[PDB]
């Protein structure tokens, strides 16, 4: 009830040994009242790393998108060695969304690394289970034999009426993920542990399907964008092996389902001037002229019989002199071109100084057209080249025309494919013009360049008209245990890709949310523009390029930081060699680098001084020493993980404050939230995500089960809590409900259409639905569109959430009237109470807690000691936690080494790994999340609590309590003990 105190463990272990003589009764009582629960103390066991590999394919569904709905791929297993290093060889195949499925090595929810089906963004199948949201549903496949070393998994996805289906060795798997989220780009993905070999069969030249695709399902190999080639890559990698060493990688650049839609500028509503008519005639003439030249150049014969089969030119006259449909076919060229031109800020010239008259007509007798003439009015330009503004205008117009035509095809019902077929309404150029390959770009822009250069020959006026916050920069800093407070240190940073990869030194308390140099906890240099960064940005040095290495050095004796580039010291604007000076030693300094999107940098701290280039040029004679010169093990780093994880509200938060008001009488013990700086400076209005620290856990067995009636209250299985929304706070901004421990969405302007949901429809071989259970990571009322919300009134809206831990329902009520939300969950689900609020008032929300008639308060659910206590209370464990966007995460010392390569045109791409790798994972029981045991090197509170837990274990098994020792062998096993022995970090 009072939280994790390291002194209560001291009390417990002092309760065990009486001045050299142990008391068996107390030792057994501790081991029977604390250990069996596995809920208070931190559990730990060894697990394997899980790595996921995807093809370079992204398919998505959107309104008016240029991509097909049906896709189908497969993976064949070649060799699996199960139970290498005493753990089941994880192997799952499925789809995954491009926004949300970003598994990182180590950590993860529950136990072990996260693979396909570990969260609601991905949906997997390991052979006999359908994995989704870290919950396995046993599927009734005809084989039910896992993924054997000889096995085939064919996976298909129909994005319209969303469904994902699997087929093992041709047998239909009796289970389908349905009605999932379409907000993103699905990609094929295989998650695996060490010791597997599989071949990715995408179809076509990239492998051959051993089973036919279902009717209407296109092969996945033809979804490759024309700008790229097929390749196997990790999902989201912050590290990649290189020649000199590991290369840190920033956040990847990813597309979106709205990027495959064309959105051209409407030009039919654009009015036309008489200038359009005046210029359009001669522009159409010149179009005919350049074309006649091409007709002469091509086999196209000069035959006025108008027969395309005999390659005959229809017009065959210098003046266009055509029938009406041909004439307007020539003129609407210029008509639509000038409409798109004037839709922008561009005007139209009127033959300034008779420039068209000045420009002459140079006829060439060699290109004589038998019918048109010796030369069909060549209209040679007067060496008027295309202005760069004009060329950008051409590409702009080319993009517009391509988008218009693609929109037409899409409205007709066309889809993009790498191969082209006409009957199935498929095109290889239907992708938007930004995603187009350069050749078709040239083919589209050639005629437009000719038109623009003709207009420039005439007198014409020339005038022109991933990336989310906390997901754009990856911060790699040295571990907090390597802080330097004295001496001369030097470390290098190679810039493999030019851009924003700010490099320098930083304080140990570098906040990962704030960018480097925007605060006082960083001293960095941004070589994208050369600008140094400390509490602002100032000009310095010079911009870098590819291959440039920055040898950042610090002098604690001289209180300076100096940046050198390629062996020469970078000087400031004033000419001072030192970039920063008078730098207080303070707590210490750490090497740090913040890489941007699609950015690659090689951070060489100096473990190999021979590998430290330019160190002899700068640093060796100056007295500077390589960072970690004599260190044997490599320096561990901490990347700024972007996973949104709930953490407690700081007591000194500059804007939000949590007040712990006492229950008193006619009021329940409640946690009220207030906005300190509301209606003043720094009055930010952002979507705040809040939850209570303790979860309520549904019963494992789902049985049918004024004055407070004692027998009803003794047999009560339901629990109640409520949230008060004050008069100032708009009810359209509060979202009252529950969240699973797998909620990691920090998107602003949250709405119930942005929740993660999936219905795992399990069925029978005949087709009858076995079950249609639903899975979601959060269950809230639609407070934004609440009938209770529907006019600003002084009343306060109280929303109660009656949850039956036995039945499984979570019925909501608003102001006594029962709401029509009846979310029903599966057994053994933990559900933290939560509200998401957009602050519109100083008094925003209040977690009232408490109880009603014949209902427990929520404290009875959270706390087992107060299970039968009907008095509402707020023990110090209960607190309000706000969602953090990013947090520090330890980079694993060794990563799973995966080799991906194509064997041939028949076999195709193959993924292989054979190097076993294990980590010890510390698992928080209430939050259902685990991290490295090595990660406790900076989390000192968890370090101390776990150390005193180990001390309690030793004290309770001490003095020959062999029964307790046997009991403790389950919590701490031989493999864990030996790995902790051999673990140097």
């Amino acid at each position: 009830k009072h939280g994790r105190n390291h002194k209560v463990l001291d009390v417990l272990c002092s309760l065990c040994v009486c001045n050299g003589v142990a008391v068996r009764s107390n030792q057994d009582l501790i081991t029977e009242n604390l250990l069996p629960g596995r809920e208070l103390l931190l559990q730990t066991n060894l697990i394997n790393y899980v790595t996921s590999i995807r093809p370079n394919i992204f398919v998505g569904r959107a309104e008016g998108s240029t991509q097909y709905g049906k896709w189908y791929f497969e993976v064949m297993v070649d060799e699996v060695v199960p139970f290498l290093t005493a753990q089941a060889t994880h192997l799952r195949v499925g789809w995954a969304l491009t926004e949300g499925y970003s598994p990182y090595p180590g950590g993860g929810e529950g136990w072990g690394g996260n693979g396909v089906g570990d969260d609601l963004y991905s949906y997997g199948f390991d052979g006999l289970h359908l994995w989704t949201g870290h919950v396995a549903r046993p599927v009734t496949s005809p084989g039910q034999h896992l993924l054997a070393p000889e096995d085939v998994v064919s996976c298909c996805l129909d994005l319209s009426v969303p469904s994902i289906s699997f087929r093992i060795n041709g047998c239909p798997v009796q289970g389908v993920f349905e009605a999932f989220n379409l907000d993103g780009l699905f990609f094929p993905v295989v998650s695996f542990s060490a010791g597997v070999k599989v071949r990715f069969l995408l179809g076509g030249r990239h492998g051959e399907f051993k089973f036919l695709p279902p009717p209407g399902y296109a092969p996945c190999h033809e979804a490759v964008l024309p700008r790229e080639r097929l390749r196997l890559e990790p999902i989201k990698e912050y590290r990649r092996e290189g020649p000199r060493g590991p290369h840190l990688v920033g956040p990847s650049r990813c597309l979106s389902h709205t990027d495959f839609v064309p959105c051209p500028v409407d030009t039919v509503q654009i009015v036309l001037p008489p200038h359009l008519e005046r210029i359009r005639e001669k522009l159409a003439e010149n179009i005919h002229e350049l074309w006649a030249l091409t007709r002469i150049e091509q086999g196209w014969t000069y035959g006025p019989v108008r027969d395309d089969n005999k390659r005959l030119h229809p017009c065959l006259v210098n003046f266009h002199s055509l029938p009406e449909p041909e004439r307007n076919y020539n003129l609407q060229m210029s008509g639509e071109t000038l409409k798109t031109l004037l839709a922008l800020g561009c005007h139209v010239g009127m033959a300034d100084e008779k420039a068209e008259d000045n420009l002459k007509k140079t006829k060439l007798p060699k290109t004589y057209m038998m019918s048109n003439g010796y030369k069909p009015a060549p209209l040679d330009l007067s060496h008027v080249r295309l202005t760069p503004a004009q060329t950008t205008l051409v590409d702009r117009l080319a993009e517009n025309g391509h988008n218009v035509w693609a929109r037409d095809r899409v409205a007709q019902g066309w889809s993009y494919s790498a191969v082209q077929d006409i009957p199935a309404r498929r095109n290889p150029r239907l992708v938007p013009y930004r995603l187009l390959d350069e050749a078709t770009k040239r083919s589209n822009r050639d005629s437009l360049c000719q038109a623009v250069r003709t207009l420039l020959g005439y007198g014409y006026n020339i005038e022109p008209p991933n990336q989310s916050r906390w997901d754009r920069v990856r911060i790699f800093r040295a571990e907090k245990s390597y802080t330097v407070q004295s001496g001369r240190w030097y470390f290098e940073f190679e810039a493999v890709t030019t851009g924003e990869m700010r490099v320098g030194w930083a304080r140990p308390e570098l906040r990962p949310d704030v960018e480097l140099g925007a605060d006082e906890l960083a001293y960095v240099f941004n070589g994208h523009r050369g600008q140094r960064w400390h509490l602002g940005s100032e000009p310095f040095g010079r911009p870098w390029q590819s291959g440039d290495v920055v040898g950042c050095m610090i002098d604690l004796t001289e209180n300076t930081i100096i940046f050198t580039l390629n062996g020469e010291v970078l000087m400031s604007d004033s000419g001072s060699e030192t970039a920063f000076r008078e730098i207080e030693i303070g707590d210490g300094f750490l090497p740090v680098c913040s890489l941007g999107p699609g950015q690659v940098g090689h951070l060489n701290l100096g473990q190999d001084v021979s590998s430290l280039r330019f160190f002899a040029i700068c640093g060796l004679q100056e007295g500077f020493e390589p960072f970690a010169i004599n260190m044997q093990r490599p320096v561990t780093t901490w990347f700024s993980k972007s996973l949104p994880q709930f953490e407690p509200v700081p007591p000194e938060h500059p804007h939000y404050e949590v007040a712990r008001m006492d229950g008193t009488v006619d009021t329940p013990p409640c946690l009220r939230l207030a906005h300190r700086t509301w209606g003043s400076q720094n009055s930010l209005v952002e979507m705040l995500f809040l939850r209570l620290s303790l979860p309520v856990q549904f019963h494992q067995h789902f049985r049918c089960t004024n004055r407070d009636d004692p027998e009803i209250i003794l047999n009560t299985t339901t629990y109640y809590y409520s949230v008060r929304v004050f008069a100032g706070q708009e009810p359209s901004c509060v979202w009252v409900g529950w969240v699973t421990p797998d909620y990691h969405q920090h998107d602003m302007n949250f709405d119930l259409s942005k929740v993660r949901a999936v219905t795992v429809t399990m069925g029978d071989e005949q087709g009858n639905v076995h079950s249609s259970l639903k899975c979601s990571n959060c269950y809230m009322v639609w407070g934004g569109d609440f009938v209770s919300p529907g006019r600003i009134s002084h009343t306060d809206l109280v929303i109660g959430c009656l949850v039956d831990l036995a039945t499984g329902l979570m019925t909501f009520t608003a102001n006594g009237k029962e709401s029509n939300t009846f979310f029903q969950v599966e057994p053994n689900t933990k559900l933290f109470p939560a509200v998401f609020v957009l602050p519109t008032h100083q008094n925003v929300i209040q977690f009232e807690l408490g109880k009603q008639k014949n209902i427990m308060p929520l404290s009875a659910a959270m706390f087992l000691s107060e299970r039968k206590n009907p008095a509402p209370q707020c023990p110090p464990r209960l607190e309000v936690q706000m969602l953090m966007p990013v947090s520090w995460s330890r980079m694993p010392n060794h990563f799973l080494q995966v080799e991906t390569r194509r064997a041939g045109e028949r076999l195709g791409w193959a993924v292989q790994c054979q190097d076993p790798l294990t980590m010890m994972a510390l698992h928080i029981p209430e939050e259902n999340r685990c991290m490295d045991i090595l990660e406790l090197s900076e989390r000192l509170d968890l370090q101390r609590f776990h150390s005193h837990t180990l001390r309690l274990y030793r004290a309770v098994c001490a003095l020959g309590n062999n029964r307790v020792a046997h009991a403790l062998c389950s919590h701490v096993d031989q493999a864990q003990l030996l790995h902790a022995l051999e673990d140097a970090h």
Partner: nanobody
Amino acid sequence: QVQLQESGGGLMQAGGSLRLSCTASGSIFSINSMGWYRQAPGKQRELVATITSGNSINYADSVKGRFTISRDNAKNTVYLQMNSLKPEDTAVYYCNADRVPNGYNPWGTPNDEYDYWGQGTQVTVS
């Protein structure tokens, strides 16, 4: 936008007149030409004598036989008259309403790629 349907099939001896009616309901954007293509069983689809708005005549590679193809623009309907018949003429005929006319492509690639297809109809010859 422009939905066009081709109808008219029959079986009779060589020399039987055949009226093939293709109706294009929609905008006049695709009125520029009414192309016709025949898919013979096991043979590359090949081109028919095509008319552009105003009934411009242009004989094609498979123009063998009497291709009396005409069309009205009031309801955008094109009728092809196969007066002659040959055993090799047995094929599925498809009509397309497209804004590119016959052998007339000065436009860009997208404007050359505007094309609307149709159902088509199998025609057999005794």
